[PDB]
Ligand SMILES: CC(=O)CCn1nc(Br)c(Br)n1
């Protein structure tokens with residue numbers, strides 16, 4: 250029993266973190282096989298921030314302009330290329346600690362673990378979710394660029410996020426490991442702003458199912474709802490639309506608990522209307538939206 | 551910017567987790583140098599657990615009754631003995647992945663990372679506090695016994711917790727790595743209950759400082775207070791007493807933010823007496839008490855553990 254925001258064990262990623270230095274700029278790189286991946290803005294100078302021409306900046310660099318340090322050891326860079334917003338440095342050593350891995354681009358609502366790193370050394374691990382507005386609510390200080398987000402399903406590490414920047418509201422933006430940004434953001438210091446964020450409805454419902462599995466029923470009610478009436482209500486609270494995909498995804502949790510998905514939607518509608526009236530659900534006084542249906546089944550059962 | 555509940559990187563501990571089987575019971579062990587540590591209740595049938603005589607039960611086991619697997623390699627157990635509530639299995643090979651480590655016993659209010667494991671395989675990591683009532687609010691399913699809690703200082707892993715049991719309220723009880731229980735619990739299937747818990751005041755204050763550092767300031771006010779006045783309020787709200795050592799420990803955060811501790815206590819007093827009035831602090835509608843002052847400084851300073 251219990252229910253915690255749980256990260257994946259970080260060891261397989263720890264063995265891949267390196268330091269990348271270019272000029273006066275140092276950030277983190279991810280070393281897999283004989284390639285080190287890092288944000289391409291490592292090659293920017295203080296004059297390049299607003300409108301960098303990365304192709305022009307990169308053609309001026311030699312392999313030996315990139316200093317890559319793995320623990321106490323310099324790696325030799327023997328080649329470089331840019332893919333979208335990530336730099337791929339070929340090095341003359343395959344990482345002996347390379348796990349089974351893949352690169353996966355995730356959708357809003359998906360969760361993943363973040364290994365926060367500074368100067369190529371891991372600092373901490375925490376759990377995040379891709380918000381509907383394509384930002385993440387992380388904990389990142391200067392020097393954290395190049396820290397990565399990942400899942401570990403069955404000893405295979407799926408890398409899904411690399412950290413590039415902090416937006417003025419204090420939330421964070423980055424790319425997949427093919428260097429494509431999540432959301433409308435760009436690696437320039439021109440004014441950009443996240444969209445208004447919304448609550449991840451399918452995740453709140455999953456977490457309510459978690460509460461029932463762990464023995465709490467106080468928030469249920471005798472009512473049901475149509476899917477369309479639910480969405481009409483929930484969007485007035487800045488909740489994401491719930492789709493038939495989401496209803497299908499919640500099938501397993503509905504079968505385990507005996508509570509139909511649209512009945513749980515009626516409970517959520519009432520909670521939005523009433524608040525919690527001094528009670529808690531799984532130890533929270535707010536509705537939690539950073540647990541996916543998959544997360545709940547893996548942690549509970 | 552940002553503030554998250556954050557665990558230490560778990561890699562150094564993952565390389566120490568093994569699977570320990572005795573009879574029909576499989577659980578987790580911690581493999582350090584040439585010894586595997588695990589809960590002594592691994593040797594009990596469900597009959598035994600009602601009223602175990604552990605010395606008696608262990609007499610009948612040979613080394614070969616202890617099946618230990620490190621990944622896909624079996625380890626050869628060559629000796630066995632108990633220390634308090636932990637079983638120590640001497641094996642024929644030192645763990646080549648043994649980190650620099652120490653066994654430490656933590657105080658209530660202190661935090662640590664838990665590496666939750668099943669069948670010797672790490673499955674998740676999360677951050678816990680030792681509660682005033684000596685339980686932890688963990689997340690554990692059957693098979694998680696022997697999972698461990700730890701902190702990292704430099705390159706040194708300080709092991710402080712080994713999981714033994716779940717209490718009826720769904721919270722968790724365990725030992726230090728020398729087998730001494732945290733709290734008034736015994737490793738036996740008998741009636742046991744968590745005592746009434748209290749809130750860790752110094753940690754709430756730490757978290758309010760974290761909030762201010764992150765720009766969440768609506769709860770600040772013009773007032774200050776005294777230790778004696780505040781502690782009367784804390785007692786009334788089932789908060790732990792604030793001592794002078796607590797105030798000293800928060801000294802750095804007081805100097806950095808410009809909010810004296812008793813200045814911040816006046817904020818906390820008003821929050822206790824009046825609630826949050828529909829507002830949140832660092833995204834929470836509850837007052838969070840599982841970040842220590844050290845946690846807040848570290849996360850707001852980027853300390854690392856390569
Ligand atoms: C010093 C910083 O703020 C980080 C460097 N950086 N360059 C770009 Br272009 C971006 Br986005 N971030």
Ligand SMILES: [Cl-]
Pocket residue numbers: 354355356359
């Ligand atoms: Cl996805």
Ligand code: NA
Pocket residue numbers: 770771772773774812813814816817
């Ligand atoms: Na004040």
